[PDB]
Enzyme design. Structure first.
Site, PDB file in Angstrom:
ATOM      1  N   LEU A   1      25.197  44.249 -36.624  1.00 13.52           N
ATOM      2  CA  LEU A   1      24.037  44.971 -37.038  1.00 13.52           C
ATOM      3  C   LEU A   1      23.279  46.147 -35.847  1.00 13.52           C
ATOM      4  O   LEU A   1      23.620  46.171 -35.580  1.00 13.52           O
ATOM      5  CB  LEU A   1      23.048  43.772 -36.724  1.00 13.52           C
ATOM      6  CG  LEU A   1      22.787  42.809 -37.337  1.00 13.52           C
ATOM      7  CD1 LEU A   1      21.974  41.105 -37.106  1.00 13.52           C
ATOM      8  CD2 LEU A   1      23.005  42.419 -39.010  1.00 13.52           C
TER       9      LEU A   1
ATOM     10  N   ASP B   1      26.300  54.492 -32.973  1.00  8.41           N
ATOM     11  CA  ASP B   1      25.940  54.793 -32.007  1.00  8.41           C
ATOM     12  C   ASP B   1      25.770  55.449 -31.070  1.00  8.41           C
ATOM     13  O   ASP B   1      26.583  55.114 -30.172  1.00  8.41           O
ATOM     14  CB  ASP B   1      25.341  52.752 -32.315  1.00  8.41           C
ATOM     15  CG  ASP B   1      24.031  52.973 -31.103  1.00  8.41           C
ATOM     16  OD1 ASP B   1      23.178  54.080 -30.419  1.00  8.41           O
ATOM     17  OD2 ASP B   1      22.954  51.981 -30.738  1.00  8.41           O
TER      18      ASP B   1
ATOM     19  N   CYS C   1      18.967  64.999 -14.556  1.00  7.57           N
ATOM     20  CA  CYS C   1      17.831  65.320 -14.920  1.00  7.57           C
ATOM     21  C   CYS C   1      16.804  63.337 -15.023  1.00  7.57           C
ATOM     22  O   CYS C   1      15.956  63.149 -14.729  1.00  7.57           O
ATOM     23  CB  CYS C   1      16.895  65.978 -16.091  1.00  7.57           C
ATOM     24  SG  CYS C   1      18.406  65.184 -17.635  1.00  7.57           S
ATOM     25  N   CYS C   2      17.339  62.777 -16.263  1.00  8.95           N
ATOM     26  CA  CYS C   2      17.119  61.292 -16.133  1.00  8.95           C
ATOM     27  C   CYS C   2      18.072  60.560 -15.881  1.00  8.95           C
ATOM     28  O   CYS C   2      19.415  60.513 -15.527  1.00  8.95           O
ATOM     29  CB  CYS C   2      16.616  61.512 -18.066  1.00  8.95           C
ATOM     30  SG  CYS C   2      15.703  62.144 -18.659  1.00  8.95           S
TER      31      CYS C   2
ATOM     32  N   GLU D   1      22.294  41.522 -45.617  1.00 10.08           N
ATOM     33  CA  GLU D   1      21.401  40.583 -44.887  1.00 10.08           C
ATOM     34  C   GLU D   1      20.984  42.166 -44.588  1.00 10.08           C
ATOM     35  O   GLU D   1      21.347  43.470 -44.029  1.00 10.08           O
ATOM     36  CB  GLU D   1      22.625  40.568 -43.649  1.00 10.08           C
ATOM     37  CG  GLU D   1      22.352  39.737 -42.208  1.00 10.08           C
ATOM     38  CD  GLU D   1      22.892  39.616 -41.414  1.00 10.08           C
ATOM     39  OE1 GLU D   1      23.137  38.604 -40.752  1.00 10.08           O
ATOM     40  OE2 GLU D   1      24.254  40.198 -41.076  1.00 10.08           O
TER      41      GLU D   1
ATOM     42  N   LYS E   1      20.061  48.779 -36.775  1.00 12.43           N
ATOM     43  CA  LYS E   1      18.413  49.399 -36.549  1.00 12.43           C
ATOM     44  C   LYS E   1      18.319  49.931 -37.789  1.00 12.43           C
ATOM     45  O   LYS E   1      18.822  50.689 -37.935  1.00 12.43           O
ATOM     46  CB  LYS E   1      17.892  50.091 -35.121  1.00 12.43           C
ATOM     47  CG  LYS E   1      16.306  50.370 -35.139  1.00 12.43           C
ATOM     48  CD  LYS E   1      15.152  51.176 -34.513  1.00 12.43           C
ATOM     49  CE  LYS E   1      14.380  50.244 -33.532  1.00 12.43           C
ATOM     50  NZ  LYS E   1      14.653  50.912 -32.466  1.00 12.43           N
TER      51      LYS E   1
ATOM     52  N   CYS F   1      18.531  67.462 -21.340  1.00  7.97           N
ATOM     53  CA  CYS F   1      19.467  67.314 -21.820  1.00  7.97           C
ATOM     54  C   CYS F   1      19.751  66.031 -23.123  1.00  7.97           C
ATOM     55  O   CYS F   1      20.649  65.795 -23.299  1.00  7.97           O
ATOM     56  CB  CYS F   1      19.812  65.000 -20.584  1.00  7.97           C
ATOM     57  SG  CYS F   1      17.985  64.343 -20.634  1.00  7.97           S
TER      58      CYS F   1
ATOM     59  N   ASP G   1      23.905  56.171 -27.165  1.00 10.92           N
ATOM     60  CA  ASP G   1      23.011  55.710 -26.141  1.00 10.92           C
ATOM     61  C   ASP G   1      23.047  57.098 -25.109  1.00 10.92           C
ATOM     62  O   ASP G   1      24.224  57.366 -24.452  1.00 10.92           O
ATOM     63  CB  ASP G   1      23.669  55.212 -25.224  1.00 10.92           C
ATOM     64  CG  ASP G   1      22.999  53.836 -27.004  1.00 10.92           C
ATOM     65  OD1 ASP G   1      22.569  53.711 -27.578  1.00 10.92           O
ATOM     66  OD2 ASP G   1      23.825  52.665 -26.308  1.00 10.92           O
TER      67      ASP G   1
ATOM     68  N   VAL H   1      20.959  58.420 -31.067  1.00  5.86           N
ATOM     69  CA  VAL H   1      20.823  58.565 -32.101  1.00  5.86           C
ATOM     70  C   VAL H   1      22.081  57.594 -32.853  1.00  5.86           C
ATOM     71  O   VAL H   1      22.776  56.851 -31.806  1.00  5.86           O
ATOM     72  CB  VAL H   1      21.517  59.909 -33.085  1.00  5.86           C
ATOM     73  CG1 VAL H   1      19.996  60.686 -32.568  1.00  5.86           C
ATOM     74  CG2 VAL H   1      22.436  60.575 -32.284  1.00  5.86           C
ATOM     75  N   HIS H   2      21.741  57.236 -33.819  1.00  6.40           N
ATOM     76  CA  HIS H   2      22.440  56.458 -35.359  1.00  6.40           C
ATOM     77  C   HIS H   2      23.106  57.340 -36.555  1.00  6.40           C
ATOM     78  O   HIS H   2      22.300  58.598 -36.593  1.00  6.40           O
ATOM     79  CB  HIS H   2      21.585  55.311 -35.379  1.00  6.40           C
ATOM     80  CG  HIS H   2      21.425  54.457 -34.820  1.00  6.40           C
ATOM     81  ND1 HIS H   2      19.999  53.558 -34.759  1.00  6.40           N
ATOM     82  CD2 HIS H   2      22.029  54.410 -33.440  1.00  6.40           C
ATOM     83  CE1 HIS H   2      19.948  53.175 -33.591  1.00  6.40           C
ATOM     84  NE2 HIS H   2      20.646  53.670 -32.961  1.00  6.40           N
TER      85      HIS H   2
END
Ligand code: HEJ
Ligand code: MN
Ligand code: ZN
EC number: 2.7.7.102
Length: 384
Positions: free
Chosen positions: A311, A104, A116-117, A39, A313, A126, A106, A160-161
């Site tokens: 699914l 995954d 910082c962010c 798929e 990316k 970071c 995040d 990252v993945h």
């Protein structure tokens, strides 16, 4: 945003590494219909996407990608039939069968320990979190589980993945996948929970090795860049992770000290002298480690990994919100990976026709394709 269509058309016509991509998802053609039952899900303009798309071979995929020029590409699982024929199949028979083991990570999940962010923002101060996250997880996958084919990819914005592609790993069930996640997870709890890490008396080798990784970075990242022990407003968050009976002793030492380094040494000595169990006279650095783990250990979106049909990316797809390209990460240069030098689709489209063959080797996307090719060559060897 408005430029994306024509840039994507050029990208998919002259820059997307189709041969390498097919080599990957075809896996040597050793199994029948392995690529034909895959798929793909294309995202078009206006957040419109189509699911259960599949193709017969490399040429068919090229023609469909150059025809749709999708903003985003998601890879799914290998199914029992052609996904694009799934409506012809009798109900209950169309089933997900195999898919790579994916992770995954995040950066948003570190907002509670980032100074910082926030949200989808990232910066060099970071990004070291991801550096540790790659090293901690990739080690465990390689050494503890024996997985040999691991593709780490920059997601394009905030993390990252990882694609684990060993053929037996592609066959694992959801239960085993969630069990692997559990083995890898130490930071548990949402914003509701204050203390998210709790260690046992006996330290499992996985925990020891992950801590030893964090120790290599903790000074520059946590005590200098983040300055987690800068003032009371910052060091009160750390004091929330230790017992109350030692707060006062730390409060004073922190005020007498002047920076995070000195205050952290004070914390380590005090914590190593704290008596957890009154039965025994056993003391250790459990608190020290719980703090480091809570501030640096990978936080894995657990649901991404347990679902066979989830699914994710595709590598070398564009992030439609940043224009950046999902590029592989050179494991031999993991510390040097700079997400801020990752090319945007606009940038490589410019490099292609910029005057001083007409393919990716003429742009800044080439070295990332080389990383992808080293990964593919290891897979080829594993088959021979
Ligand atoms: N609406 C959606 N339907 C199905 N799958 C979806 C989806 N939105 C996202 N996904 C899948 O989840 C992956 C992780 O989401 P996210 O972390 O927000 O995106 P990313 O690709 O990791 O890029 P970053 O913003 O995190 O850097 C998606 O990759 C996949 O489509
Ligand atoms: Mn992500
Ligand atoms: Zn930052």
């Amino acid at each position: 945003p408005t430029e994306l269509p024509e840039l994507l058309k050029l990208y998919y016509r002259r820059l997307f590494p189709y041969s390498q991509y097919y080599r990957w998802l075809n896996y040597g053609g050793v199994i029948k219909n392995y690529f034909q039952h895959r798929e793909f899900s294309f995202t078009l303009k206006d957040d419109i996407y189509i699911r259960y798309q599949s193709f017969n071979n490399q040429s068919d995929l090229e023609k469909e990608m150059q025809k749709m020029n999708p903003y985003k590409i998601d890879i799914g699982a290998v199914y029992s039939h052609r996904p694009n024929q799934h409506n012809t199949v009798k109900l209950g028979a169309f089933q997900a069968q195999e898919k790579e083991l994916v992770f995954d990570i995040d950066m948003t999940d570190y907002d509670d320990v980032r100074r910082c962010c926030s949200s989808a923002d990232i910066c060099p101060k970071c990004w070291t979190l991801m550096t540790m996250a790659i090293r901690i997880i990739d080690r465990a996958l390689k050494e503890d589980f024996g997985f040999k084919h691991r593709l780490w990819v920059y997601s394009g914005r905030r993390g990252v993945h990882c694609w684990v592609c060993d053929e037996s790993v592609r066959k694992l069930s959801s239960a085993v996948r969630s069990g692997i996640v559990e083995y890898l997870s130490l930071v548990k709890g949402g914003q509701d929970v204050k203390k998210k890490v709790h260690l046992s008396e006996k330290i499992h080798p996985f925990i020891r090795k992950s801590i030893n990784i964090i120790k290599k970075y903790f000074e520059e990242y946590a005590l200098v860049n983040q300055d987690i022990l800068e003032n009371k407003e910052s060091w009160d968050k750390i004091l929330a992770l230790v017992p109350e009976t030692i707060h006062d002793e730390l409060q004073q030492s922190f005020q007498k000290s002047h920076n995070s380094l000195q205050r952290w040494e004070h914390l380590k000595k005090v914590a190593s002298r704290y008596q957890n169990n009154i039965k025994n006279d056993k003391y250790g650095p459990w608190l020290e480690w719980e703090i480091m783990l809570q501030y640096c250990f990978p936080r894995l979106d657990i649901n991404v990994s347990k679902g066979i049909n989830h699914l994710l990316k595709s590598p070398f797809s564009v992030h439609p919100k940043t224009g950046r390209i999902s590029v592989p990460i050179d494991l031999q240069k993991v510390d040097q990976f700079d997400p801020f030098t990752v090319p945007t689709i606009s940038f490589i489209c410019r490099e292609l026709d910029a005057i001083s063959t007409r393919d990716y080797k003429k742009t800044s996307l080439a070295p990332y394709v080389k990383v992808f090719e080293h990964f593919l060559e290891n897979l080829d060897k594993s088959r021979k």
